[PDB]
């Protein structure tokens, strides 16, 4: 995350780290949506242009974390994946449309002060909150400056970072890019003239864009970090998977198996 700040402890207890076994590395962010289900972006697992194709055994999920690199001994839990489900119409050939995947954990996690699931939006929550100008919040351990085109400075965080970003109007999203934007995406970020900045960046993909409902004071995941052109470039925006529009498929997979 570019231009954000260190998270408080327990500020984001649904944040999950996607970690590969060998070589041990951070792949992506993710989120905890119940005791045995994790939500992420499909491109974290499966991306043929780059010969990426992770299976269950390639991966660990780490939950409860704050520090990026430390093994957080009585705090984090590590889990194994039973099964990965990618959306059957994820469009990796063109524009990362339907960039979403579910992961089933081998055994349930216990919740704690540091480990707690986020809610998924219902229709009326999506409709109220998903509005241009409303701010949401993105979290992650990814790069602090664009090495997604070789920037330096600080590089990589020691702790989870956080940034709050306004949702942008669709016209302005589509006029920032040459990529074809679908109804399964939204964008977010500050305009060049606003004076604030900030963005997701490499290693942040797959994690949560969340908002807090003013009606019931709960946190809901509205987006998944999906793609962007660069990190924190002026006149460019972050694009996110639209979680409510894909909620039928989410309910399908968690209903069909399914205990």
């Amino acid at each position: 995350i570019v231009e954000g700040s260190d998270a408080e402890i327990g500020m984001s207890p649904w944040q999950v780290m996607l970690f590969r076994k060998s070589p041990q590395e951070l792949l992506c962010g993710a989120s905890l949506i119940s005791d045995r289900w994790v939500l992420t972006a499909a491109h974290c697992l499966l991306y043929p242009p780059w010969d990426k194709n992770f299976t269950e055994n390639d991966l660990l999920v780490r939950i409860g974390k704050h520090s990026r690199t430390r093994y957080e001994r009585n705090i984090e839990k590590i889990s194994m994946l039973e099964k990965i489900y990618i959306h059957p119409r994820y469009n990796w050939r063109e524009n990362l449309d339907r960039d979403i995947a579910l992961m089933k954990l081998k055994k349930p996690v216990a919740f704690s002060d540091y480990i707690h699931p986020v809610c998924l939006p219902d229709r009326e929550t999506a409709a109220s909150l998903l509005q241009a100008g409303y701010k949401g919040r993105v979290t992650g351990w990814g790069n602090l400056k664009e090495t997604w085109t070789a920037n330096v400075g600080k590089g990589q965080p020691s702790v989870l970072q956080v940034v709050n970003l306004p949702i942008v109007e669709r016209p302005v999203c589509k006029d920032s890019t040459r990529i074809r934007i679908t109804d399964n995406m939204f964008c977010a970020g500050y305009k060049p003239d606003e004076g604030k900045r900030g963005d997701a960046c490499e290693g942040d993909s797959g994690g949560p864009f969340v908002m807090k409902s003013p009606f019931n004071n709960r946190w809901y995941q509205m987006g998944i970090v999906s793609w962007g052109e660069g990190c924190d470039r002026d006149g460019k925006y972050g694009f996110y998977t639209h979680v409510f529009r894909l909620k039928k498929w989410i309910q399908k997979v968690i209903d069909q198996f399914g205990e």
Binding site: Q24, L60, T69, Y71, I78
Partner: peptide, 10 residues
Amino acid sequence: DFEEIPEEYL
């Protein structure tokens, strides 16, 4: 770069 994780997780 990562601290080492416990072998029961591999």
